[PDB]
């Protein structure tokens, strides 16, 4: 039952490669969390006197969200994720954004601790994909999108 691509790393904005299976594209850390981390920084430039329109802010956010790397996983396992649907309450979106690296570390462990023994899980394949997500410099990833979104 293993899908061929359970655990493949893929931009959120990629729908071509995986259409066909029920695979979900999981956000670690949650999409809202990156989005807030991006906003916390934008807020700070503005308070520093930057000139950034809201159109610009929304564009940046959307890039942060839809260009994130994400791990294709199956939907029952995504349901036990830390930030699935209503589990993503403001207090957890706040704590996640204030330390992304800790957030991806927590999120990917519980995914992987629930991919044990599940026949259609890809615990071997997921852990390798997870490791590079815990190691990506997310704070850089947002600085890039911010500077791109403000260059004009």
């Amino acid at each position: 039952k293993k899908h061929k691509d359970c655990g493949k790393k893929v931009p959120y904005n990629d729908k071509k490669s995986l259409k066909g299976s029920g695979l979900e594209k999981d956000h670690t850390p949650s999409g809202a969390a990156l989005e807030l981390a991006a906003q916390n920084k934008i807020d700070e430039l503005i308070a520093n006197g930057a000139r950034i329109t809201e159109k610009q802010q929304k564009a940046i956010l959307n890039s942060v969200r839809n260009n994130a790397p994400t791990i294709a996983i199956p939907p029952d396992i995504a349901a036990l994720g830390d930030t699935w649907r209503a589990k993503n309450k403001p207090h957890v979106i706040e704590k996640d954004a204030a330390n992304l690296k800790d957030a991806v570390a927590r999120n990917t462990k519980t995914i992987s601790e629930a991919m044990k023994n599940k026949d259609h899980g890809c615990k071997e394949a997921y852990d390798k994909a997870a490791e590079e997500l815990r190691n990506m410099d997310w704070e850089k990833y947002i600085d890039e999108a911010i500077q791109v979104g403000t260059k004009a």
Partner: protein, 158 residues
């Protein structure tokens, strides 16, 4: 689309679910509300009236004074007065301000300059941070906000 920005100002600090603000809101045909279940959906954007309304999901940690109870606090908004594609604000402005005005006239009306840089001016007046932004020499937008810890440590408000 006709909302009166000056009337937005009194809901500043109030919640997502404040009855008067919700009435006010769906009176002008909005019904979009902020939520976090899908993404970080904390702005209500009205593209062609030239207005964006901004909510925070973390009023306290930011030092924002909450008025009504709720999860989404109205922190500020942008009045866009210039764009190549459509979507500017034609309605009235607070404190006798006009889109025609120049930085010097804007300065004269808000009376309380707190920081001046090549492209933005920050003023503090009636509990509100006002930032005027100038594309070239043109008045571009006017961002308002309730006081925040960020704006306090940048010495823009107390």
């Amino acid at each position: 689309g006709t909302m009166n920005a000056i009337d937005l100002i009194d809901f500043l600090g109030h919640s997502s679910i404040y009855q008067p603000f919700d009435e006010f809101l769906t009176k002008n045909g909005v019904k979009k509300r902020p939520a976090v279940g899908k993404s970080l959906d904390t702005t209500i954007s009205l593209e062609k009236e030239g207005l964006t309304l901004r909510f925070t999901i973390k009023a306290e940690s930011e030092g924002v004074a909450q008025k009504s109870d709720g999860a989404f606090v109205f922190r500020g908004f942008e009045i866009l007065l210039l764009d190549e594609d459509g979507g500017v604000y034609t309605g009235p402005l607070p404190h006798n301000l006009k889109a025609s005005d120049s930085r010097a006239e804007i300065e004269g009306k808000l009376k309380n300059l707190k920081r001046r840089m090549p492209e933005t001016d920050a003023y503090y007046l009636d509990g509100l941070v006002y930032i005027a932004a100038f594309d070239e020499d043109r008045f571009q937008y006017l961002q308002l906000s309730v006081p925040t810890n960020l704006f306090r440590k940048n010495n823009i408000c107390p």
